[PDB]
Design a protein around this ligand. Sequence first.
Ligand code: CLA
Ligand code: CLA
Ligand code: CLA
Ligand code: CLA
Ligand code: CLA
Ligand code: CLA
Ligand SMILES: CC1=C(/C=C/C(C)=C/C=C/C(C)=C/C=C/C=C(C)/C=C/C=C(C)/C=C/C2=C(C)CCCC2(C)C)C(C)(C)CCC1
Ligand SMILES: CC1=C(/C=C/C(C)=C/C=C/C(C)=C/C=C/C=C(C)/C=C/C=C(C)/C=C/C2=C(C)CCCC2(C)C)C(C)(C)CCC1
Ligand code: OEX
Ligand SMILES: [Cl-]
Ligand SMILES: [Fe+2]
Lengths: 335, 447, 35, 137, 32, 82, 340
Amino acid sequence: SANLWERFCNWVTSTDNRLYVGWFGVIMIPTLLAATICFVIAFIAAPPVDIDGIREPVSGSLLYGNNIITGAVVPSSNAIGLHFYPIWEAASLDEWLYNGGPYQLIIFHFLLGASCYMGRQWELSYRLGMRPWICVAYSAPLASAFAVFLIYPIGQGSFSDGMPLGISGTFNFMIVFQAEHNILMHPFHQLGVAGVFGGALFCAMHGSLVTSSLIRETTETESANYGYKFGQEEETYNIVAAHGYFGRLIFQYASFNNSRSLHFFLAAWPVVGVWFTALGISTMAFNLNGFNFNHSVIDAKGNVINTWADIINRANLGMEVMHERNAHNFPLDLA
Amino acid sequence: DQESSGFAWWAGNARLINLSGKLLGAHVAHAGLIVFWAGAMTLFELAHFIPEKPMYEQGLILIPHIATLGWGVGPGGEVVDTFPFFVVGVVHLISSAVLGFGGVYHAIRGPETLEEYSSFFGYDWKDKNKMTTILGFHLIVLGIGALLLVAKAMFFGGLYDTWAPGGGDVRVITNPTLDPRVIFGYLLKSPFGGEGWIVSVNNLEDVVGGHIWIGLICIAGGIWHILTTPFGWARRAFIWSGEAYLSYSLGALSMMGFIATCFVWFNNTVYPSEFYGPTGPEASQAQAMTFLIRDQKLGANVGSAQGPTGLGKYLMRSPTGEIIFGGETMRFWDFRGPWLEPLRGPNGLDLNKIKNDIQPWQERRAAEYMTHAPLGSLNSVGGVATEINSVNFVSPRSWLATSHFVLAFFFLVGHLWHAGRARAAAAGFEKGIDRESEPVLSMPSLD
Amino acid sequence: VSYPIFTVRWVAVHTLAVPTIFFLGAIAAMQFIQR
Amino acid sequence: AELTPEVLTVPLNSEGKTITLTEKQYLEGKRLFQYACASCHVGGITKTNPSLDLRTETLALATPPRDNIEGLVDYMKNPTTYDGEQEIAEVHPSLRSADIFPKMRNLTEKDLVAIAGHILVEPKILGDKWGGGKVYY
Amino acid sequence: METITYVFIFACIIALFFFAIFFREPPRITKK
Amino acid sequence: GTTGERPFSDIITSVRYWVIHSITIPALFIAGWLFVSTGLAYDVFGTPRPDSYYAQEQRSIPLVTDRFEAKQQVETFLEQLK
Amino acid sequence: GWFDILDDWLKRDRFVFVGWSGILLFPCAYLALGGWLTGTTFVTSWYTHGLASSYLEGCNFLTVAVSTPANSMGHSLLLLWGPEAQGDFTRWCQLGGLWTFIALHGAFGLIGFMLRQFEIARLVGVRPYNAIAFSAPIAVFVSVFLIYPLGQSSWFFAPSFGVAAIFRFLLFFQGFHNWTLNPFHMMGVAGVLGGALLCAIHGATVENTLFQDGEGASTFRAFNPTQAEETYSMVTANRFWSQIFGIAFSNKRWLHFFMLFVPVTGLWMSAIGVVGLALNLRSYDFISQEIRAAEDPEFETFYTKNLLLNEGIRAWMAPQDQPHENFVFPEEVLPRGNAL
Ligand code: CLA
Ligand code: CLA
Ligand code: CLA
Ligand code: CLA
Ligand code: CLA
Ligand code: CLA
Ligand SMILES: CC1=C(/C=C/C(C)=C/C=C/C(C)=C/C=C/C=C(C)/C=C/C=C(C)/C=C/C2=C(C)CCCC2(C)C)C(C)(C)CCC1
Ligand SMILES: CC1=C(/C=C/C(C)=C/C=C/C(C)=C/C=C/C=C(C)/C=C/C=C(C)/C=C/C2=C(C)CCCC2(C)C)C(C)(C)CCC1
Ligand code: OEX
Ligand SMILES: [Cl-]
Ligand SMILES: [Fe+2]
């Protein structure tokens, strides 16, 4: 043995592993395994949870009357708020499952691991001699999970207001959010869909342009994909013919001819847009909401002339007025 | 001297990585912009400042910073003399011209490099001795500054204490907590609900005291780095380059940016609700107070009142048994505040004090903070997203917290970016994979 | 080269440029309307 | 559809006598109402006590009557409960408590009349909106 | 019955994941 | 990489261009301005003036209730000093 | 022949390619954009929706819109010279004639544009996979702005051309159709979100697996516009993702087709769902859930919660959102939780 620990460090850092367990991996793999196992068990068999701390248990597990679409892992109780609630903080598991214990165990483990997952996306790139910044692109979806699972609860003062772990539970998070923050009328969110729409747009753009400008090397009755071999020297598509077409679709100078300038834009646009949408949730976590144009335009006498912004407000009221029925005792919703 | 044959235009400032002279001009011209803002903004705030009106209702974020240091304020945060505000503003604004001068000078007139025009000021990124030395210099400068606060608090006037015995007022701290067990105890505090870590500071004694420790420790480490070099591990662990050092400081600011966000949002002491707005929990607490006060005057027995869920309309229990406010405000049972504390007992809110020790100044305080919760829109319309235009207001606590989170976040990205490049720059592939010697092609197939 | 003036590009550009400024002028005036 | 002086004619006192405000007074009142009332009385309601609104009818059934310039103005100096059997200047903004409510320090009798007028003119314009809450938004 | 069906499909996807990762077609270079 | 059209760079730089457009560009602007400030725009698109949303007393909306006699119904809405 | 001479002229390589398609594209496309920009600043929605919708009235870039016609109009084409407007232009504007103008014109503008793709591709001699892709945006516009209101009572319930006017279209579909609970919609976002991932991940992958073809740090200049060698290491990228994610591409031709498939398939699925919403054949409820919820007052899921939000949306919005119904909902009939 050259040195146990020295060998250990060499195995971890080894680039010859089927899955690169890195130094970040040493933290990632255990945390992610704890998160997923607890999730899977919860989603199936967990008992109803008193999310709003008003002794009104919400069942979100399969065995308790739910399906995939409705089922979810319910956030910790509102009676707990931002308090740390590990298993060893409960008199029993029965109590722990009642107060939304699993939720914290999952989100904490996930966010931790998902962060290390980003750290690993650097490490492997380092060990392979390639440029970093791939992890920087992954920082945008991660910052959203952080905003949705941690930042918003911190701001609002309770983990019960963090996004639930389920399909329908996610819809609830949105509808309520819109009511209290008017997110559709917020620039950061708008920039978000801009990146997301644009993303899907550009993804289809590039995708189509490239695959349409492929050099012929296949038969008429043979898959056009086989005209490429893993580990080629030259390019498999005519980027000059691609630019020629798209350059005529709009106009030359509004078309890319530099593959590197292309793929940068392909990466920059969605990442930056999602970055803002992540900052949107994080900003509206401190109640800096979207534009309020309610009763803006009024006539010469003073009568209120409605706009679409007002029609939006009515829909918002309905959500506000109806959400969390028995949770409110006082006029203003300040929590 | 420097053009396209170094970096691209949109990466221009990276051409100055090895131009100590000009790279000094930037930092000095930049530092002027910071002083310029602080100065010009203070005067802007003062020019709009209305004395007989709450500061948080006027979009102030610098004048309340001055107020905290015990300047121009008195009993209950009452603004007495606006001259210290005017001074702090104009003095800064002036110093910006001085710094701006040197900045411009060092960047377009003075020596483009320093190493020759002065071996003392000239430096080498890989010179672990010069780096730890320059670091040692700033570690002292920051250290004295930490004592500059201690001096103002203990000698030159004091600070605004909201927890003041006779009610919020400027008080001279003459008993700083120097007990390390207490001081460094904060660092060992949880960051979750209840135990609030650094943000949980609730008295100026600790604030002043803590700063004494920091001031000394900083200068102490300042001297240490002057008279030493990085050890063995310290050298075999870090990356030594101009970019690497930047990255280290970038993540540092990012972390501090997040801590500041939680500070202005949660802390009551070093961020007085008299100058800033009421904190998030404070406002929700106030509503429970207000209507507990109201309905009780209508003849309601708050102690035994049963709400819709059967939990306790006005008063309920915390998970550990303490008597707290009812409703959704159950999440903010960790709130502490001058106006609310005299109603608190050894087991939480005392039903007897609640029943007949409610003071008028508390009722209108609760009403004030309730109708000034940190809720607002981007276009500054106070209230819930469904409110109507009338009250133009957004709590300063909201502005600061959101602004400094965006900055903190992007700086964490700035960190990753510059740290990722530095690792690739050092090892030498930050510009592409070597066509000839492609590392991956030399590794066995995992398939 | 001896470039021309009036071209198809010229037409296109003007179909957007001419109304735009006309609108930008119109909207700019609206900023002073009241009640 | 405009703010005629026909609309700006509001009852001055209990004895039927009326007063006619000007577009200058209205705007000034509206501005002052935002300055020292909107905080709690946005859109004619009362956040710290939703049971009592600024409806003309509600002000009429008050004690004393507060549905006129004189009424409201008196209230802004020495506010009382709905039955008038208790003075509440200590927990309510007023002239005799300007030391407690700094916003009321600047306010002069001209300001008081403008604010009072605003409260009486708004329901003439907005109607049900002025009284009700989110329902009529 | 429903719960069983949901878990089954889920279990099948996880099973697929395994085979997809560790029992893929070895990516061969040049001579493919 | 080139076509018949005269390179924008040259045109936007040519003194002749500005000699022309220092006149043309502001002209359109002032024209659009007048289009609004003279209240003409209000009539071209039937857009109500600030004092033309309701009648003095009326608080109802002039909603068109039938397609074929809409135009006639609309004119009737303008009748009531709306 | 004049035809081939007409052809010659059209298919001439200019700065802005015209072509045969251009005869359809440019007229419509210009009037569509023009019609919007016109109504956006001048035309009102008072007589049709009881709404201000132009800069002239005080609306801003967010609150402006070209609102749909009244519900009275029905599915009328609303021609300028039609029975409604009767040649009158001002009336035409006040009856929301500009909506059907923008819609129908823009519709043909989308037809011409794809034709352009087809026409230009043929000339350049490239495959028309750019036209196939553009079918997804077509289906959406057709299904949402045409098919959907054609299933409803009138054009009135179509999405109005405007920023805010689209946000209510979202909230409406939530409140009334429970659109988020629709499987076709889920596939929709799965395509768009997943497509916005492929876009991101692939670009970042390429920029950070590049070869060194220059001596500068800004590797943008170091690209060869004339094909030759691959500008980025496809082999390194493969091994990377194979170790961090477990799965990785290894066939650029498939990778790029996949980038076409995912977002185009998604939008198509979202279209079908909307086509079903035209007949109101929505995915509103789960019968098994409701039946237990009726008998058992203690059964609560995140699904039941949402429906309560929908009832609130419908009740509080319908009056001012559907003026033609003359809705009058007394305060006591309005569904409300406690305190709020
Ligand atoms: C202490 C802070 C700090 C410092 C000293 C540097 C220093 C440097 N960075 Mg940088 N960076 C930082 C923070 C910092 N960074 C953060 C927080 C991020 C995350 C966003 C980045 C992201 C970043 C990238 C992506 C790149 C650099 C690069 C560089 C180098 C060249 C400088 C450059 O490109 O200027 C050029 C400056 C500009 C082009 C100006 C950009 C303008 C911004 C994007 C808009 C700001 C919005 C503004 C607030 C709104 C104003 C409104 C407007 C209408 C007026 C230089 C060493 C470049 C490099 O070569 O890497 C080594 C490079 O490519 N940085
Ligand atoms: C905080 C902002 C800041 C600062 C301090 C600097 C500072 C600097 N940049 Mg720079 N830069 C910045 C932002 C900044 N940059 C941004 C945002 C970009 C992206 C657009 C760039 C892009 C860029 C490039 C591409 C290059 C630099 C370079 C330089 C250096 C030489 C400047 C030069 O060529 O002088 C030229 C000076 C002039 C042409 C005259 C400008 C007028 C002066 C400087 C401003 C006067 C200020 C004030 C009005 C006067 C007050 C006087 C009063 C005190 C009496 C200098 C250290 C160069 C370099 O690497 O150095 C070799 C270089 O090539 N920068
Ligand atoms: C960063 C710290 C900070 C904070 C917390 C504040 C906070 C405040 N400022 Mg302030 N200010 C700042 C910096 C800051 N300022 C700076 C640096 C300047 C110099 C330009 C000013 C100049 C200034 C003026 C002149 C005024 C204020 C006012 C105010 C108050 C009202 C807020 C408001 O209406 O803004 C709302 C502002 C916005 C909604 C703009 C948001 C802009 C975002 C950040 C753009 C982000 C886009 C992004 C960068 C795009 C890049 C992406 C691209 C690269 C792809 C509030 C207390 C006002 C006041 O005191 O009146 C009561 C006032 O009149 N500020
Ligand atoms: C970050 C700040 C900083 C730094 C590191 C330097 C560094 C330098 N400057 Mg300089 N400068 C600065 C700011 C700075 N400057 C500013 C703001 C201005 C505008 C007024 C100038 C104007 C300026 C000119 C006009 C010249 C220099 C020159 C020089 C170089 C020769 C050294 C010298 O002149 O010192 C000599 C002085 C001393 C060693 C002692 C000065 C001590 C002062 C008087 C007290 C400072 C008090 C301080 C604020 C508080 C610290 C105490 C605290 C620890 C308790 C050197 C590289 C010269 C040059 O280019 O030569 C190569 C030159 O001609 N500077
Ligand atoms: C911001 C100011 C600053 C900076 C940049 C540095 C920088 C440095 N110091 Mg240092 N130092 C400072 C202030 C500073 N010092 C002060 C004020 C003192 C006096 C107490 C010292 C005393 C000091 C000593 C005695 C030594 C250094 C050393 C070093 C070098 C190696 C550091 C290292 O490897 O840490 C890496 C740190 C670790 C591997 C430990 C990680 C575990 C951390 C502490 C806990 C987890 C952090 C957590 C995320 C934060 C939560 C807070 C916590 C309380 C819960 C480096 C150049 C060493 C050196 O080379 O000497 C020249 C050395 O031996 N420093
Ligand atoms: C080729 C481009 C093109 C196309 C396809 C359209 C298409 C359309 N426009 Mg249009 N338009 C265009 C360019 C175009 N426009 C231009 C350039 C302008 C600016 C002047 C306009 C201005 C405009 C306005 C102002 C209006 C339209 C409208 C319409 C729509 C209904 C028109 C209609 O009934 O068609 C009728 C179709 C034809 C006339 C085609 C007939 C072709 C045959 C072969 C000729 C036969 C003639 C002969 C006499 C017949 C003898 C038979 C005998 C029994 C009598 C339709 C979608 C209306 C609309 O959008 O309503 C909502 C509307 O009000 N257009
Ligand atoms: C380098 C460079 C740069 C930068 C620059 C800078 C950054 C500068 C700075 C500058 C500065 C930083 C400046 C400053 C100035 C200041 C001043 C000059 C001041 C003045 C003051 C005064 C005058 C005062 C007085 C007063 C009072 C007391 C009150 C009343 C009023 C008054 C205001 C009058 C740039 C980017 C551009 C470019 C590149 C290069
Ligand atoms: C309807 C109609 C028609 C048509 C008309 C037309 C065609 C018109 C046009 C018009 C137009 C054509 C207009 C235009 C306008 C435009 C505008 C108004 C624009 C504006 C702009 C702006 C405002 C910008 C902004 C921005 C952006 C966007 C980005 C960033 C930056 C900035 C800020 C710059 C006709 C007669 C045929 C027939 C009848 C009816
Ligand atoms: O949790 Mn969901 O919902 Ca944010 O707000 Mn307050 O608490 Mn509750 O009320 Mn609304
Ligand atoms: Cl809910
Ligand atoms: Fe690609």
